[PDB]
Amino acid sequence: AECSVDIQGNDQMQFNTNAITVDKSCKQFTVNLSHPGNLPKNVMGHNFVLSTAADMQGVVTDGMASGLDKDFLKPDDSRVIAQTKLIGSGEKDSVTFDVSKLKEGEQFMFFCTFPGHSALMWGWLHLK
Numbered sequence: 001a002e003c004s005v006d007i008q009g010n011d012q013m014q015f016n017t018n019a020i021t022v023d024k025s026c027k028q029f030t031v032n033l034s035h036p037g038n039l040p041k042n043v044m045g046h047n048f049v050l051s052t053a054a055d056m057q058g059v060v061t062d063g064m065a066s067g068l069d070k071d072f073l074k075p076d077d078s079r080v081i082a083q084t085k086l087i088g089s090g091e092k093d094s095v096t097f098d099v100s101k102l103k104e105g106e107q108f109m110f111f112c113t114f115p116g117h118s119a120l121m122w123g124w125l126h127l128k
């Protein structure tokens with residue numbers, strides 16, 4: 001009945017959750033990302049990117065290669081189920097995606113693609 005979650009990425013290169021479950025009665029699900037803390041996005045930006053477990057490491061790698069100007073994401077990446085923009089201190093962004101896009105019994109990964117951040121900024125997302 002709650003079709004959204006609030007997640008934070010801070011100056012310690014952590015998300016404030018590592019697990020998100022989505023009610024299977026939701027048609028859409030919304031992730032609202034914010035960045036408390038004081039560092040600007042060119043040194044400690046975060047985004048929220050959702051993919052299969054299989055695609056995560058590729059998306060992270062090609063994101064790094066894409067650079068800060070493209071928010072550390074490859075443009076038109078068919079592996080990305082959903083993504084926010086890259087944000088810095090005091091900013092927020094949100095993304096809404098269709099729940100039909102998630103398969104029952106499959107666990108998806110969410111992560112940040114800012115270089116190195118996926119060391120700690122990763123999590124699971126699945127229906128339930």
Ligand SMILES: [Cu+2]
Nearest residue numbers: 046112114117
């Ligand atoms: Cu980050």
